[PDB]
Every structure is written in C-alpha cells, then in structure tokens.
Amino acid sequence: MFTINAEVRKEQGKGASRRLRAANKFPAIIYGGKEAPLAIELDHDKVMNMQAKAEFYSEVLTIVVDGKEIKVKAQDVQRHPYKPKLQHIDFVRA
Amino acid sequence: SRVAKAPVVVPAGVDVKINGQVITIKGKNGELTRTLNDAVEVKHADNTLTFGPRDGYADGWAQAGTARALLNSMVIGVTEGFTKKLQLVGVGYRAAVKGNVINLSLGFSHPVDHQLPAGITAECPTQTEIVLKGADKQVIGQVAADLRAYRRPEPYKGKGVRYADEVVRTKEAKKK
Amino acid sequence: ALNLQDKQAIVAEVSEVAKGALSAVVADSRGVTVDKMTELRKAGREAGVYMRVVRNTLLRRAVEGTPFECLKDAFVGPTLIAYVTEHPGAAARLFKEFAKANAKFEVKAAAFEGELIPASQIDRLATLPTYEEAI
Amino acid sequence: MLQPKRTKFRKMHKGRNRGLAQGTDVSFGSFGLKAVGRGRLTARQIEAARRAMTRAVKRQGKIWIRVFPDKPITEKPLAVRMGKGKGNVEYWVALIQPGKVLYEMDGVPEELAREAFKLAAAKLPIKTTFVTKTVM
Amino acid sequence: MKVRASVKKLCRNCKIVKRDGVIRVICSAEPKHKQRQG
Amino acid sequence: YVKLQVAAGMANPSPPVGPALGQQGVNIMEFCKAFNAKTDSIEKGLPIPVVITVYADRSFTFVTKTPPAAVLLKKAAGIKSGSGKPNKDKVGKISRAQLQEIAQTKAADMTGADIEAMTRSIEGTARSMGLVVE
RNA sequence: AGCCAGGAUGUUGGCUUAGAAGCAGCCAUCAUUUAAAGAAAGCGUAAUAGCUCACUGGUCGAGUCGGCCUGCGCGGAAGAU
RNA sequence: GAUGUCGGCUCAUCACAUCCUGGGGCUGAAGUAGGUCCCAAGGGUAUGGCUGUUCGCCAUUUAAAGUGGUACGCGAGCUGG
Ligand SMILES: [Mg+2]
Ligand SMILES: [Mg+2]
Ligand SMILES: [Mg+2]
Ligand SMILES: [Mg+2]
Ligand SMILES: [Mg+2]
Ligand SMILES: [Mg+2]
Ligand SMILES: [Mg+2]
Ligand SMILES: [Mg+2]
Ligand SMILES: [Mg+2]
Ligand SMILES: [Mg+2]
Ligand SMILES: [Zn+2]
Missing domain, CATH: 3.90.930.12 (Ribosomal protein L6)
Incomplete structure (x- = not known):
C-alpha cells in the first residue's frame, strides 16, 4: 500500500511551481467526484522512488493531506524533458 | 585506518x-x-x-x-632484520664483496664498484649471487634497486641483475 | 553466492542424514586432487557412506539438533563429513587407509553413541568388523 | 542517407532552435537514446550513428529513427563575395531540442542496447542519455 | 607510454593512478597498456 | 607421461605414434608388441585409448582404457565420420537399448554411480556430434 | 580485499587439418563426480605439457560494492620583442 | 594632400608544432639500423646545374641540410632579373 504525504498549496502558477522544484518538491493535483480539486505539493525524492515500481500506476494509493486520507489512482505524469525527475502528477479520486 | x-x-x-x-x-x-x-x-x-x-x-x-x-x-x-637476494644472469657476469664494496663484472669496459651505505652488509655465496642484510627496509630496498639498475633484466634472454623472487618475462625477436 | 534459502536447505539435508546414520567421520581434506576424491566417493557410495564438504558455520547448525553436539570443536579448518547410513563403521576404516596412503591431512575426530572420539583413539571404530560377524 | 523525397520549396530561412522537444518518450521500442543537448543532426551523423548501433546488435532486434533531416542547408563556395543570391543546398539537418528521443530499440537485452547506444552517441555532436520505456 | 586525452583501463591488470596531478594507467601484464593523460 | 589412442591390432606406423612418444624416451619395438598382445581380445576396427607412465630410467608401464564415447557412437549408428555442424545436421540414429550398451562398456572409466547417470553422459556425446536419440 | 587449498571425469567433444588434445577456425555447448570447476576468460606448445582466471572450501573478523541527484576543483590546453 | 611590389644580397631576432646533437616510454625493439611518442630551443642546421623565381626537379655533400612569426623581417641598407 503506497502512502504519499502531501501539503496543500498556499500558492499557484509558474513562479510558485518553479520555486517548489528548486526546493526538491513538486506540484500535483487531486480531482474527480463531487469534491473540488485539491492543489497539493509532494516531496520529490519520496514519490520518485515510489513511481519506480510498476504497481504505482496500477494500484490504489493513499494520499495523506493534513491528517485526512484520500484514496486515489495515478491519472497522468508530467516528466522532466531529459532528467530522471517529475514535474507534476494528476491524481484521480478512486 | x-x-x-x-x-x-x-x-x-x-x-x-x-x-x-x-x-x-x-x-x-x-x-x-x-x-x-x-x-x-x-x-x-x-x-x-x-x-x-x-x-x-x-x-x-x-x-x-x-x-x-x-x-x-x-x-x-x-x-x-631484512634480507634481499640478487642473482646475476648472463655470460661473464660475476660479483664479489671486499668489505663494504661490491665489485661487479657486468659486461662493461670498466668493472663497477658499488660502495654500500651505513647498516647494509653484503656477502657473495656464489660468483653469481648477492645477499644484502640490514635493519632499514627502505635502505636495503634502495641498495637492491641501485645494484639492479647497472644491468636491468633484458626481455630477450633474461640477462642482467635480477631479484631472487623476480619473474623475468622473455619474448621472441621480430620474425624475419 | 549462497542465499539464506540455500543455507537453510543445506542445513535441512545434513540434519536429516544426521538422525538416520550411525557412525559419522569428521576430517580435513586440504591439498588433495579431485582424482583421489572421486576415488574416495566411489569407495564411499559402495560402503553405504554419505560424503560431503559443508561450511563449519552451517555444520554447527545441523549438529545442534543432537547427538553430534560434541563434534563442534572439530568445525575449525576444512571439514569433510562421512555419514554411514548403512552398517556402522565403513568410513572410520576407509579414511584411515586413505590418510596413510596419501600422507596429506590428519583426520579431525570421529563420532558414535553420541560421544566424542579424539584424533589418537580412532582405532576403536577402525577394528570393528561386520554386522554379519556375530554368526 | 535520410532526406525529403520532394519539398514544396528548395531553400529555407535560417530560423532559430529555441524551446524544449516534442516526442520525449520511448513510443515504439523498449529503449531510447534521448538528446540532452541542443543542436543540428546532419543526415551523415544520423546514418553514422545508425550504422554503429546496427553493427553492435549484430543486426538482431529492431531499430527506430525518431528524427528526420527535413531542413535544407545552403553554403557559399570559396572566392565568392557576399550577396548575389542565396547559396546552394549542400546537406540536410534535423533541429534537435533537449528531450528528443533520437533512436529507439527493442528485441535486445538492456546491456547490449546500452552498449550499442554508447557507440552511436560518439558519432553525434550533442550530449545524449539512455532512456527506458515507462508505464504512462 | 601512450600520451592521450582519454586514458582508460585496457585489461584487468591495468590500474588508474594519480601521480603528481596527472592521471596515469599503470599495467602489470602489458607494457603497451602504459598510458599518461595529456 | 603422454596420452594416446592406438588401434586394436595396429601399433607401429610413423605418422600417428612414431615421433610423438619416441621423442620422450620410449622403446618403439617393446611397447608396439606388448600393447597388441593385450588388446587381442578387443574387436577389429575399434580405437582403444592407452596412457603411458615413464620414469627416469627410460622404463615404461601402461594401463589400457575402454574405447572413447565419440568412438562407440559411430559403430552403433552406422557412420564412419560425424557431422560437421552438430544439432544443425543429423547423420544417424541410436535407440535407448544402444545407449545402455555403450554405458555398460564405459563403466570402468565413468564417474557415475547409477546406470541412468552413465547413460546421460553418453547422451551428451551424441548431441555434440549430430547424432539424434531415436 | 589479502593469504592457504582445489580448479576434476566422459574427453584428445564433433568437423577440419601434417597437427587443433579448453586455447587457428566452424558448429554444438550438454552430462557426470560434486564444496566447486566454462566442453573453457588470457598467456604459452609444431600439437601435448605447463601457468593462471570464472567458481568453491578454509583463514581473517566488520564492514563492503557501484549506480542516481547535486556543489567546487583536475587533465584535455602549442607561438612568435 | 603616396604605408614602394616579387625574388636575390647583406644583417638578423623570436616561436617550437624539434631537422641534427642530449634525456626517456612503447615497439610487430636480438645486434646494427628503424618505426612511434614524450621531455628539451644550448649550439648547430650544404655547395651547385636549370629557371627572375620563392618553390621545385636534378647532381654531390652533411650529424642535420627543421617548420613558422617578425609590414609574406630587412630599397632614407644594396640589387632591379
Ligand atoms: Mg516569470
Ligand atoms: Mg615525478
Ligand atoms: Mg602626409
Ligand atoms: Mg615540445
Ligand atoms: Mg601518431
Ligand atoms: Mg635554436
Ligand atoms: Mg655553365
Ligand atoms: Mg640524411
Ligand atoms: Mg616583405
Ligand atoms: Mg637607394
Ligand atoms: Zn593492462
């Protein structure tokens, strides 16, 4: 069971997203259902080592946003053009 | 460490x-x-x-x-104490000790007379063998190298001053 | 490379043969060619003896389950085991002739009755004849 | 040697080679040779690299060339002054932005594909990286 | 001695050594494998 | 000390055994007749291997070994020469009864404990020469 | 990592060749005794031998191996008063 | 409202990418002689036949007959092919 820790984004946009990546973190989104989409930030190293396993893209993952637990499935991934890094992840509510 | x-x-x-x-x-x-x-x-x-x-x-x-x-x-x-053993290989190659001086006949016009330093002593059990003895591992090592230097083992017949424990790889001359 | 699964399997195979056999022979075999060994393996299978070279750490594990728990102090240096499953004796005599004829090694210690036999007193299991001798 | 079979026009403006690549994923094979640099690959460089990797895999497996040299390059000869019309077309290049998957391979073990790509990379004017196929 | 920009181990007996800020390839088996970076 | 393979009733010609064993220090007329006197029981047209043990006094003692595995598979299948490209080109066929016949003869030199162990050791010699088990 | 010991049998695998016996080439690459030993990674022989490795048992006694993201350096680096 | 052009002569000065001599590694280096490369700029580094030639070809030397920069060095120094 993959458990991802996340914080809610206090900011949005180009400026703010680039600042996260410089801080070894990356933006991501949680959408789907009647619920409003949740803009979140993830630790780069942690999620990077997780996504290395094929099960990440198939299995239901749990995202821990300020105590609360959210069952999701990896919908889409924006990868760095040439480096082994992640730019953004789309998470769909399962 | x-x-x-x-x-x-x-x-x-x-x-x-x-x-x-x-x-x-x-x-x-x-x-x-x-x-x-x-x-x-x-x-x-x-x-x-x-x-x-x-x-x-x-x-x-x-x-x-x-x-x-x-x-x-x-x-x-x-x-x-330490012991380095050298052996002379080749026709006419001979050695003898006269106190603290190693007289070496190594195919040159003039015979080679090597003066030993303080603490290193040498004896020739054969005309083709040098046995060095001392307390300083670096100095015995140095003297052994200098004696070898006069005639380093050639790669076509193994001729020259070689260490006792030395593996002297030989080769064939260019064909034709 | 030996995995723990492989190590547990080797402890199992030598633990099973430990119970069943009657007389076990522990000896050195360093500096002996495969030609003389394949010759003691033919002379072993014939006399109903089980021949093996096992890691001394792996031996102190298969032997902890009793009765050879006195062969511990013999698991220092190269160790070769001779488990006689068919008729007690066989190996303790087969090794004594192989030791004298080849001059290499010394033969560590022998075991029978769940008791320790020193390197000097191996003449006890060497003079014992057949089963098959009382008639 | 790759080249367009026909073109709407003979010659083309120099232009620029700004921006990041499109086609940054192994989409046909199991392994790829991704560009980390920015530059032009000539039809001769592309062929040189293709030959190197083909010889390497002993003509087993399958190779894909994700780049096409569709850009005509003109050149003025020696002892020719400036002006008097645009030069003549001499060779064809493919503009390369960081991220472009240049070559793809499958039907060979990772170790071999890695070596074949090491050999081809030496024939190229831009820095490359080895890439593997991914689940999304 | 082979002086070149790219110095590499050519066999198992080759050894990479740094002598007075110069990368060298010293080889016990083959004298032809002796390299200096320059 | 040298290893050779000489015929059942033939030992004397210069190209196969002549200066091969004679260069060490072995009598060319003493061994040639002592070998054929002991290999007289061995069938005609079967190469028999022999190992020579020489000492410092030019003296010699030999122990005769059973015919080779690649040798017995040729007479059992009915072939003079093997396949140039084994497992790519089939040159003959040998039954399971013929495999145990070669193994029972080779028992004196084989390392195997059981009949099935010696039979599989002949199965490997057949595959590596183009002969298929049928 | 170092050091001690082994690195066997069928078998000189088959074909080819004056010879090819792990070691010119070509094709196959199993099976046995096994602690482990490729029908053989290199040197050596006219072909053998002989030397060593892959692999494994012993000794020793606590760390060791090399990929990833990165900061700053090193080589690559020859010119004319 | 002028910075005389090629070649020669005379006189040079620097670079080193070294022709010779010196030191050294590899060699498919037995020796003699070579090949290749590294260090080294201290000194040294032909005369002639033909052509305005530089060059080049040729003859005969020599340890060698280096490659370049200096307004393709040098006409308020000479020559004028
Ligand atoms: Mg901005
Ligand atoms: Mg120095
Ligand atoms: Mg004026
Ligand atoms: Mg220089
Ligand atoms: Mg060169
Ligand atoms: Mg000078
Ligand atoms: Mg005249
Ligand atoms: Mg000359
Ligand atoms: Mg001028
Ligand atoms: Mg004037
Ligand atoms: Zn090397």
Whole structure:
C-alpha cells in the first residue's frame, strides 16, 4: 500500500511551481467526484522512488493531506524533458 | 585506518624512545630513528605501540597508517632484520664483496664498484649471487634497486641483475 | 553466492542424514586432487557412506539438533563429513587407509553413541568388523 | 542517407532552435537514446550513428529513427563575395531540442542496447542519455 | 607510454593512478597498456 | 607421461605414434608388441585409448582404457565420420537399448554411480556430434 | 580485499587439418563426480605439457560494492620583442 | 594632400608544432639500423646545374641540410632579373 504525504498549496502558477522544484518538491493535483480539486505539493525524492515500481500506476494509493486520507489512482505524469525527475502528477479520486 | 588501528607489538629486548614526533627503536640488530608526520599521535603504554590521527589534521588516518607500517618494519628490523637476494644472469657476469664494496663484472669496459651505505652488509655465496642484510627496509630496498639498475633484466634472454623472487618475462625477436 | 534459502536447505539435508546414520567421520581434506576424491566417493557410495564438504558455520547448525553436539570443536579448518547410513563403521576404516596412503591431512575426530572420539583413539571404530560377524 | 523525397520549396530561412522537444518518450521500442543537448543532426551523423548501433546488435532486434533531416542547408563556395543570391543546398539537418528521443530499440537485452547506444552517441555532436520505456 | 586525452583501463591488470596531478594507467601484464593523460 | 589412442591390432606406423612418444624416451619395438598382445581380445576396427607412465630410467608401464564415447557412437549408428555442424545436421540414429550398451562398456572409466547417470553422459556425446536419440 | 587449498571425469567433444588434445577456425555447448570447476576468460606448445582466471572450501573478523541527484576543483590546453 | 611590389644580397631576432646533437616510454625493439611518442630551443642546421623565381626537379655533400612569426623581417641598407 503506497502512502504519499502531501501539503496543500498556499500558492499557484509558474513562479510558485518553479520555486517548489528548486526546493526538491513538486506540484500535483487531486480531482474527480463531487469534491473540488485539491492543489497539493509532494516531496520529490519520496514519490520518485515510489513511481519506480510498476504497481504505482496500477494500484490504489493513499494520499495523506493534513491528517485526512484520500484514496486515489495515478491519472497522468508530467516528466522532466531529459532528467530522471517529475514535474507534476494528476491524481484521480478512486 | 585498518593498518593504523592494528597495534605494533614491541618485544622483550627492544627499547622504544619517543621525543614528540621523533622515535628511536633500539634492538639486537641495530638502532633506527624516524620523524613521524605531525598528523600522527603515537601512544606507548604496555608492550605495544598505538597510532592515531591528531585533531585539526585532515589526512590524519592515512598518515597514522604509514607511521604504523614504518614502525612495525623498524621493530622487525632491529630484531629479525631484512634480507634481499640478487642473482646475476648472463655470460661473464660475476660479483664479489671486499668489505663494504661490491665489485661487479657486468659486461662493461670498466668493472663497477658499488660502495654500500651505513647498516647494509653484503656477502657473495656464489660468483653469481648477492645477499644484502640490514635493519632499514627502505635502505636495503634502495641498495637492491641501485645494484639492479647497472644491468636491468633484458626481455630477450633474461640477462642482467635480477631479484631472487623476480619473474623475468622473455619474448621472441621480430620474425624475419 | 549462497542465499539464506540455500543455507537453510543445506542445513535441512545434513540434519536429516544426521538422525538416520550411525557412525559419522569428521576430517580435513586440504591439498588433495579431485582424482583421489572421486576415488574416495566411489569407495564411499559402495560402503553405504554419505560424503560431503559443508561450511563449519552451517555444520554447527545441523549438529545442534543432537547427538553430534560434541563434534563442534572439530568445525575449525576444512571439514569433510562421512555419514554411514548403512552398517556402522565403513568410513572410520576407509579414511584411515586413505590418510596413510596419501600422507596429506590428519583426520579431525570421529563420532558414535553420541560421544566424542579424539584424533589418537580412532582405532576403536577402525577394528570393528561386520554386522554379519556375530554368526 | 535520410532526406525529403520532394519539398514544396528548395531553400529555407535560417530560423532559430529555441524551446524544449516534442516526442520525449520511448513510443515504439523498449529503449531510447534521448538528446540532452541542443543542436543540428546532419543526415551523415544520423546514418553514422545508425550504422554503429546496427553493427553492435549484430543486426538482431529492431531499430527506430525518431528524427528526420527535413531542413535544407545552403553554403557559399570559396572566392565568392557576399550577396548575389542565396547559396546552394549542400546537406540536410534535423533541429534537435533537449528531450528528443533520437533512436529507439527493442528485441535486445538492456546491456547490449546500452552498449550499442554508447557507440552511436560518439558519432553525434550533442550530449545524449539512455532512456527506458515507462508505464504512462 | 601512450600520451592521450582519454586514458582508460585496457585489461584487468591495468590500474588508474594519480601521480603528481596527472592521471596515469599503470599495467602489470602489458607494457603497451602504459598510458599518461595529456 | 603422454596420452594416446592406438588401434586394436595396429601399433607401429610413423605418422600417428612414431615421433610423438619416441621423442620422450620410449622403446618403439617393446611397447608396439606388448600393447597388441593385450588388446587381442578387443574387436577389429575399434580405437582403444592407452596412457603411458615413464620414469627416469627410460622404463615404461601402461594401463589400457575402454574405447572413447565419440568412438562407440559411430559403430552403433552406422557412420564412419560425424557431422560437421552438430544439432544443425543429423547423420544417424541410436535407440535407448544402444545407449545402455555403450554405458555398460564405459563403466570402468565413468564417474557415475547409477546406470541412468552413465547413460546421460553418453547422451551428451551424441548431441555434440549430430547424432539424434531415436 | 589479502593469504592457504582445489580448479576434476566422459574427453584428445564433433568437423577440419601434417597437427587443433579448453586455447587457428566452424558448429554444438550438454552430462557426470560434486564444496566447486566454462566442453573453457588470457598467456604459452609444431600439437601435448605447463601457468593462471570464472567458481568453491578454509583463514581473517566488520564492514563492503557501484549506480542516481547535486556543489567546487583536475587533465584535455602549442607561438612568435 | 603616396604605408614602394616579387625574388636575390647583406644583417638578423623570436616561436617550437624539434631537422641534427642530449634525456626517456612503447615497439610487430636480438645486434646494427628503424618505426612511434614524450621531455628539451644550448649550439648547430650544404655547395651547385636549370629557371627572375620563392618553390621545385636534378647532381654531390652533411650529424642535420627543421617548420613558422617578425609590414609574406630587412630599397632614407644594396640589387632591379
Ligand atoms: Mg516569470
Ligand atoms: Mg615525478
Ligand atoms: Mg602626409
Ligand atoms: Mg615540445
Ligand atoms: Mg601518431
Ligand atoms: Mg635554436
Ligand atoms: Mg655553365
Ligand atoms: Mg640524411
Ligand atoms: Mg616583405
Ligand atoms: Mg637607394
Ligand atoms: Zn593492462
């Protein structure tokens, strides 16, 4: 069971997203259902080592946003053009 | 590090004198002295010698490893002693000792007379053998190299001054 | 490379043969060619003896389950085991002739009755004849 | 040697080679040779690299060339002054932005594909990286 | 001695050594494998 | 000390055994007749291997070994020469009864404990020469 | 990592060749005794021998191996008063 | 409102990417002689036949007959092919 820790984004946009990546973190989104989409930030190293396993893209993952637990499935991934890094992840509510 | 952490056991009859960084090791075979690198902290105590780094020195452990190794072969030196054996290969190549001078006939116009330094002694059991004996591992090693230098083993017949434990690889001449 | 699964399997195979056999012979075999060994393996299978070279750490594990728990101090240096499953004896005599004829090794210690046999007193299991001798 | 079979026009403006690549994923094979640099690959460089990797895999497996040299490059000869019309077309290049997957391979073990790509990379004017196929 | 920008281990007996800030390839088996970076 | 393979009733010609064993220090007329006197029981047209043990006094003692595995598979299948490209080109066929016949003869030199162990050791010699088990 | 010991049998695998016996090439690459030993990674022989490795048992006694993201350096670096 | 052009003569000066001599590694280096490369700029480094030639070809030397920069060095120094 993959458990991802996340914080809610206090900011949005180009400026703010680039600042996260410089801080070894990356933006991501949680959408789907009647619920409003949740803009979140993830630790780069942690999620990077997780996504290395094929099960990440198939299995239901749990995202821990300020105590609360959210069952999701990896919908889409924006990868760095040439480096082994992640730019953004789309998470769909399962 | 794995070397520095391993203690040197000073046997009975061996006197160790430490004056800061200067170490004098006196035994039955002789007396050797060495100045250790400032990064080394040498401790005596019991029938052993222990080495370690000194605070503020970057390469401390590497230095302490060398310091150990040298002091271990200093102890071996003043007790057991060291022996290097050389053997002359080739027609007319001969050697003889006359006190502290090794007379070498090695295919040159003039015979070679090599003066031995303080502490190294030599004897010729054969006309084609040199046996060096001393307490300083570096100096015996140096003299053995200098004697070898007059005629280094050639690769077509193995001719020349070679160490006893030396593997002299030979080859065939260009075909046609 | 030996995995723990492989190590547990080797402890199992030598633990099973430990119970069943009657007389076990522990000896050195360093500095002996495969030609003389394949010759003691043919002379072993014939006499109903099980021949093996096992890691001394792996031996102190298969032997902990009784009765050879006195062969511990013999698991220092190269160790070769001779488990006689068919008729007690066989190996303790087969090894004594192989030791004298080849001059290499010394033969560590023997075991029978769940009791320790020293390197000097191996003449006890060497003079014992057949089963098959009482008639 | 790759080249367009026909073109709407003979010659083309120099232009620029700004931006990041399109086609940054192994989409046909199991392994790829991704560009980390920015530059032009000539039809001769592309062929040189293709030959190297083909010889390497002993003509086993399958190779894909994700780049096409569709850009005509003109050149003025020696002893020719400036002006008097645009030069003549001499060779064809493919503009390369960081991220472009240049070559793809499958039907060979990873170790071999890695070596074949090491050999081809030496024939190229731009820095490359080895890439593996991914699940999304 | 082979002086070149790219110095590499050519066999198992090759060894990479740094002597007075110069990368060298010293080889115990083949004298032809002796290299200096320059 | 040298290893050779000489015929059942033939030992004397210069190209196969002549200066091969004679260069060490072995009597060319003493061994040639002592070998054929002991291999007289061995069938005609079967190469028999022999190992020579020589000492410092030019003296010699030999122990005769059973015919080779690649040798017995040729007479059992009915072939003079093997396949140039084994497992790519089939040159003959040998039954399971013929495999145990070669193994029972080779038992004196084989390392195997059981009949099935010696039979599989002949199965490997057949595959590596183009002969298929049928 | 170092050091001790082994690195066997069928078998000189088959074809080819004056010879090819792990070691010119070509094709196959199993099976046995096994602690482990490729029908053989290199040197050597006219072909053998002989030397060593892959692999494994012993000794030793606590760390060791090399990929990833990165900061700062090193080589690559020859010119004319 | 002028910075005389090629070649020669005379006189040079620097670079080193070294032709010779010196040191050294590899060699498919037995020796003699070579090949290749590294260090080295201290000194040294032909005369002639043909052509305005520089060059080049040729003859005969020599340890060698280096490659370049200096307004393709040098006409308030000479020559004028
Ligand atoms: Mg902006
Ligand atoms: Mg130096
Ligand atoms: Mg004026
Ligand atoms: Mg220079
Ligand atoms: Mg060159
Ligand atoms: Mg000069
Ligand atoms: Mg005239
Ligand atoms: Mg000349
Ligand atoms: Mg001028
Ligand atoms: Mg004038
Ligand atoms: Zn090497």
